[PDB]
Symmetry: C3
Subunit: 450 residues, 3 copies
């Protein structure tokens, strides 16, 4: 039957010592709560009820495009009170899964298993085994069905040795939630309405509560501070790296690899140590990425080698291209097949045609460069003062001599040759050779001050 989700995301996260609310801190480049929202969507959730409160304006701005129901909680009275804020929107005939915005690593696979196990009119409770369960609510089974969650302070000597504990994640139908949430009381040391009390209330109605164990404890771990957040980050990155390794990506050291988005890859892709992949990246067959590279939102064709300490963003690189080391591709850089970009070169919002080379100490911005061009060392595209970033157009088979300035707007036609040290302000015609006439003074017998 249908499914909807409730995500608790109202927490201040005081121990983060941040102006952000708790769930907006990122794992792998995206907010903890976004991980959970995405997981909820992957499960096929019809509605996603987001319980929010602290940092409300920041939540709204940071998650503006998320397809969620914004349930603004005015006061924090416990998890049961939080869930009950969304209860009026529950369908009687749908399943509801309760999730936590500060526990981001819960997987679709584990939640599918939880939902599957839910008995009619009953509850499916996600549990986990801990080597040291001290502090956590112990799962008491009579059958394989949960009759109680006994808290640390109430447990007898025998119960304290129970390793299986409550995670707080649970599934039940909407009608049952609406029914039981209205019966939850707050007579306890904290004065809070606990969602945990639904296990008791379910048993009061002779409805069975089934336990389902999480595969990894890190799926249910929350982040209360940045040390814990860093632990989740490393676990997540290791898991991502392991998946890629088993898919056939050669990651030289998975402990020194970071994926912050999505990676599409071909076969025989090699990634050296300390590479960061951000946004949506596509790598073709036999792509080799050297140490220290940063790729953000890029498409890299087959057989490309990116040499060390290259930074690429919002760019496209054709097959058999060679980039780096120390290359910078800024947004809008489009390199054709078999191109060459070398050290201390910056390309911004420019197209570079097949076979062309830009190998040293050069800035190319707002330009179109044709096929088989030779852009010499020290070449710079620039503008007049007060300009609006006008374009430099370079044709096919053009030689641009070293340390030449190309002053936009300007066009250099096919087959043109430009001598070293030239300032190009007027258009250059097809097969036109332009060389600078220098005036020099030569003084003989100049003894250096040494």
């Amino acid at each position: 039957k249908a499914l909807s989700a409730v995500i608790l995301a109202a927490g201040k996260g005081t121990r983060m010592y941040s102006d952000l609310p708790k769930v907006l801190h990122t794992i792998a480049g995206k907010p903890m709560v976004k991980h959970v929202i995405d997981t909820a969507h992957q499960l096929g959730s019809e509605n996603i009820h987001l319980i929010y409160g602290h940092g409300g304006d920041l939540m709204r701005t940071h998650l503006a495009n998320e397809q969620v129901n914004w349930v603004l909680q005015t006061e924090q009275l416990g998890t049961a009170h939080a869930v009950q804020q969304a209860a009026p929107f529950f369908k009687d005939n749908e399943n509801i899964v309760v999730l936590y915005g500060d526990a981001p690593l819960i997987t679709k696979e584990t939640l599918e298993k939880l939902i599957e196990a839910k008995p009619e009119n009953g509850i499916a409770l996600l549990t986990v085994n801990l080597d040291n369960p001290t502090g956590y609510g112990r799962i008491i089974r009579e059958n394989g069905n949960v009759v109680a969650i006994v808290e640390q302070k109430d447990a007898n000597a025998e119960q304290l040795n129970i390793k299986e504990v409550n995670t707080g994640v649970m599934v039940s139908d909407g009608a049952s939630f609406k029914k039981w949430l209205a019966r939850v009381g707050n007579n306890n040391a904290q004065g809070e309405y606990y969602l945990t009390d639904l296990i008791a209330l379910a048993n009061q109605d002779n409805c069975q509560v089934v336990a389902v164990q999480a595969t990894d404890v890190m799926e249910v771990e929350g982040a209360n501070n940045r040390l814990q957040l860093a632990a989740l980050e490393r676990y997540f990155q290791n898991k991502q790296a392991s998946k890629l390794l088993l898919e056939g990506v050669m990651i030289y050291d998975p402990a020194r690899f970071d994926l912050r988005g999505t990676l599409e890859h071909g076969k025989d892709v090699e990634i050296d140590v300390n590479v960061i992949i951000e946004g949506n990246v596509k790598l073709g067959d036999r792509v080799k990425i050297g140490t220290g590279c940063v790729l953000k939102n890029v498409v890299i064709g087959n057989d490309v080698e990116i040499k060390p300490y290259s930074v690429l963003e919002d760019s496209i690189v054709g097959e058999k291209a060679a980039i780096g080391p120390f290359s910078r591709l800024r947004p809008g850089a489009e390199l054709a097949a078999e191109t060459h970009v070398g050290n201390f070169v910056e390309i911004k919002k420019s197209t570079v045609g097949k076979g062309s080379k830009v190998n040293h100490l050069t800035y190319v911005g707002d330009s179109e460069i044709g096929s088989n061009c030779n852009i010499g060392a020290g070449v710079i595209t620039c503008n007049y003062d007060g300009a609006n970033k006008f374009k430099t157009i370079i044709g096919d088979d053009v030689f641009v001599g070293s340390d030449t300035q190309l002053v936009a707007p300007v066009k250099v036609a096919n087959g043109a040759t430009i001598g070293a040290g030239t300032t190009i302000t007027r258009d250059v015609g097809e097969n036109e050779l332009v060389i600078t006439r220098v005036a020099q003074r030569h003084i003989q017998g100049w003894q250096r001050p040494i």
Copy 2:
């Protein structure tokens, strides 16, 4: 009552295979012995007696400004002999704590606890529990008071299972040290005067020896070689990173973070992987540091972003500035608020005014640049041959065209405009436009050799 410290630092450190003496090898950028000296000072030590020997001249040069008593030991006859070298300087009425220059991670907190526990006319002995205590002197308690330290070769089957062992760190009063040190003998397999024998001598005088356990074993671990030193380094860096994380600094991977000095920070500071912080660094609120950056002795204002692979030293950066990627700030670089420094740019001993930009392939040295200037790509400040690094002075609202050389000493006044490819040797006046008149030869129908 008063406190003084004795630090054993005479060792050759043969297994380091170094020309340095043992205690001068660094942890987090400073000598092992300096860590211990600093800890001794933090405790409120009145005197610090440094027992030294091997590499004496190097010790003297490397630790010249340390407020210690230089006790030169001419021969190594054991720990008791070493401590007795400083004994004539002990006050009868002060406490003396014995520390080791090759065991650098001992904390102030642990030592305060040790001193607190010292009974009058007795000894406080720092101990530690080891899972495998094989090789170490076993602590024999009768009460919670130490009656013997039984060495591995002397221990019976029962005593070998004792996990608590001697660390060698101890506190006693000066009069008691002077008394007992004179009674220590050398009748043992090594022929050495052992400080350990004070436990026996104390009990001979019916003076109680109290045991105090160290929190972490790494506090009492020594470094005999560079493998062990590296282990201490990693433990120390992890501990530093954890502290910063709990304080609210977002360190993306604490295993790839290095602090070699002191870090002052605001809130919501983000530090990406493989960053090194050296000397005294201050970061404001919401500072973001990209991957691969090196910051040494820098002050960074609020809301600054440092992009990847930037190296900064002895520099100041104003609020909302943008630095990198691939930026180099050398000593004396002072960037005002809202400045921009880009890839392949080097700034040395220069001031750059509010809003100014230096974004590509540029060297600015020994210069003053005003507010809202545009320093084009390829611009270089230089000197005449035989000069003494003279200054380039650039006013407010100046445009410097790409690939221009500024030849110091030279002044460019407010509002001036300099065309691309210019060589500036004479002063430029207010609102003066200077453009280079180029001579070019144009040859039509030049067929390239392709």
Copy 3:
């Protein structure tokens, strides 16, 4: 007596998801099979029989210069069948050691111990203790001599608790191999001729099989996929780093150090985090390597400092030189003693004489530079269009002004001085001062568009 080796290397390595065969994937920059071949050679193997099959053409091209006997297996019928392919080449009177091309970390020391233990006309079997031996063939000893290898599915409750298991590595004489290999059958669930059956056949002949335990399990671990390969890589790099640390090399973080070849070092060498050493590298005394450096096939003299993010290949650096940060040395770079190479500088196939400095934003290619030269910022060596990379020759004590282009072929004699912004096309004589005569237009009262 004499020794020869058989290496099994025929596997497809399907779970690598690669166009390469299994054993060509690299550990520390070289094919897994090459590690084993080298180890076989270090042991003093007279012949090395390489059993190959899948990716045969790639094996042949990648391992063309290896001194091995190429035994092409046409079908995979089990390990015994594989070894029997080389059996006709076994000497009756030599020992034969069987090794696996996908288990690269087996050490010479372990194999020497295995060979030593081999009883006459018997077998030496390499075994290993596993905490969880589930799945592996259990070693059954009667004496300290192996009477059976009992597989998981056949073992009784008692035998399953045996921790010692078969690795598959074994030594026996050539005559015995030829004898027993002909008796191996394939009556089992897999229908394969197993080398394991030699233990049974040896006991049938009343020949003793002796067990020898491997020191580390990682010596006998195979890599079936890239996740397992990465685990072997990290173990190997840690082991290499540990060796260097114990030899006296200061590696700041051995978890962030990579050696992919061989390193020769002096004393007091310091290597910061994220350094990669490739090919054959030699470092002198007191060499300091900053973070992020890549050194491939380089010789570095005494007292050289390489600052962060420098990339060096096929280059030589004289004593007391200073390189970096952000320096690029390409093949053929030869720097003399006391030279200086700075940020955003690229040197290719050039010699640079004693005391000379090239400190900013410069390309020097195909050049000879003499002693005590000053190569200014922005200097570029270049060629005419259609040239064949001709040479620039610069003498001793030459000053080259900033942003000057040197157009090869050209010679600049001793003591010459070149002004900033010059284009040098004609040879410059001894003590000749060359300065560019600029034409400038100065327009007063030019109000900028701001």
